[PDB]
């Protein structure tokens, strides 16, 4: 076998649930599983390099890294320094309601209710504008906003569709459902250095295949649950 080993350098954020987080002395998450599955098909060898989002692109610029799979969302401004592949996840804001809440079904059914959000999120603006709330409970951590819904001190919560789902699944055990569809949708994608080009198209085809194959659904169930 000698040293024909692929020097592919992969990079992720130190802490970022539920995509790349440390659990059981091993980084775990959706993005890790995705790159593992892609590799199987592409038959390439990877070496995850953990760093702060601050240096992810800066590094890709000098190609100190050859690929990066964090929560990089497709953005044309950034394309001046890097290049993205077809997205692997639909981002956006979702609405959690107690499962027994069969009255609310969407964000427009919230006019005149209590919606819990987190400070420094995009949930605030959408609500400050597209929504007519009798009260906006801006908490500094969603965990507490989840309590409010659990104590029916709020009618529903508004936060990233990924997060709301992980919890509906992890420590959800009912009394928590999702309604409607992801608002302000975006797409998450792998980021390849400008120099790399075929490696990109190769990975693009790989993702088309795995989504064509559809094992993504099972991985989706493991993290974000049933679509
Ligand atoms: Na209740």
């Amino acid at each position: 076998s000698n040293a024909a080993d692929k020097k592919l350098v992969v990079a992720t954020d130190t802490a970022f649930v539920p995509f790349e987080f440390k659990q059981g002395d091993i980084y775990v998450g959706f993005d890790v599983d995705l790159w593992a599955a892609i590799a199987k098909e592409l038959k390439l060898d990877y070496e995850l390099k953990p760093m702060d989002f601050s240096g992810i692109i800066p590094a890709l610029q000098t190609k100190n890294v050859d690929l990066a799979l964090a929560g990089i969302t497709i953005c044309d401004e950034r394309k001046k320094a890097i290049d993205f592949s077809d997205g692997y996840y639909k981002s956006g804001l979702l609405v959690m309601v107690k499962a027994n809440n069969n009255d609310v079904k969407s964000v427009k059914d919230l006019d005149g209710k209590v919606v819990a959000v987190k400070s420094g999120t995009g949930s605030v603006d959408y609500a400050k504008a597209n929504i007519k709330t009798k009260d906006l409970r801006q908490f500094p951590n969603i965990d507490n906003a989840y309590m409010e819904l659990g104590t029916n001190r709020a009618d529903a919560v508004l936060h990233d569709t990924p997060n709301i789902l992980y919890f509906i699944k992890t420590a959800g055990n009912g009394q928590f459902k999702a309604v409607g569809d992801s608002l302000e949708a975006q797409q998450y994608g792998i980021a390849f250095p400008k120099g790399s080009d075929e490696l990109r198209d190769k990975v693009n085809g790989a993702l088309k295949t795995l989504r064509e194959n559809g094992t993504y659904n099972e991985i989706y169930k493991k993290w974000f649950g049933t679509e």
Side-chain angles (χ1 to χ4, degrees):
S1 302
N2 292 124
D5 302 356
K6 303 80 188 175
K7 307 181 181 184
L8 296 194
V9 181
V10 193
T12 51
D13 198 2
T14 311
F16 192 57
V17 302
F19 287 117
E20 49 262 357
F21 52 115
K22 178 194 160 196
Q23 171 190 120
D25 313 302
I26 177 184
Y27 281 112
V28 76
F30 192 65
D31 290 359
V32 171
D33 301 3
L34 191 87
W35 184 235
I38 299 172
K40 172 184 181 180
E41 299 308 300
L42 292 195
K43 197 181 179 180
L44 301 176
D45 289 345
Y46 55 68
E47 185 206 60
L48 269 73
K49 173 163 292 182
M51 31 167 65
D52 301 358
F53 209 116
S54 308
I56 294 187
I57 297 170
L60 282 186
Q61 194 61 58
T62 299
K63 209 153 190 178
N64 298 357
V65 193
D66 307 359
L67 177 63
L69 275 66
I72 294 169
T73 304
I74 305 177
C75 208
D76 312 1
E77 170 68 0
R78 318 173 188 178
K79 297 175 185 173
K80 301 177 179 302
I82 53 175
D83 286 301
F84 302 65
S85 60
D86 294 0
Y88 53 74
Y89 186 56
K90 297 183 178 181
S91 181
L93 276 51
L94 198 63
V95 173
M96 184 176 282
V97 303
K98 280 240 303 185
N100 47 62
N101 188 358
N102 298 175
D103 304 3
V104 177
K105 293 179 179 179
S106 70
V107 296
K108 298 169 182 176
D109 311 0
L110 295 184
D111 289 345
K113 303 290 180 178
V114 184
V115 171
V117 289
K118 175 185 183 179
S119 68
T121 59
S123 51
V124 175
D125 193 5
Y126 187 76
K128 183 178 179 180
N130 308 60
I131 310 187
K132 183 178 179 180
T133 53
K134 291 187 175 181
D135 206 301
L136 184 77
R137 298 195 157 243
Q138 293 177 335
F139 290 1
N141 197 1
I142 54 176
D143 289 345
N144 299 358
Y146 289 179
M147 275 187 240
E148 291 283 296
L149 185 52
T151 54
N152 286 174
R153 297 248 298 120
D155 297 297
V157 187
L158 180 66
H159 197 59
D160 304 357
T161 305
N163 310 4
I164 280 195
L165 280 186
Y166 189 61
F167 171 63
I168 277 177
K169 167 72 64 180
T170 62
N173 308 60
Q175 297 182 0
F176 289 118
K177 265 191 167 186
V179 289
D181 297 298
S182 187
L183 295 174
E184 210 74 60
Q186 294 300 320
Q187 285 271 359
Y188 278 114
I190 309 180
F192 317 73
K194 291 180 298 182
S196 63
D197 199 2
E198 297 184 0
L199 307 186
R200 314 200 294 240
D201 309 359
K202 288 191 56 180
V203 180
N204 215 59
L207 279 181
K208 297 173 181 173
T209 287
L210 177 63
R211 276 182 315 266
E212 159 73 2
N213 296 359
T215 59
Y216 173 108
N217 303 299
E218 307 310 299
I219 314 301
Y220 206 70
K221 294 181 179 185
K222 293 179 179 179
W223 294 118
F224 310 111
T226 59
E227 293 177 350

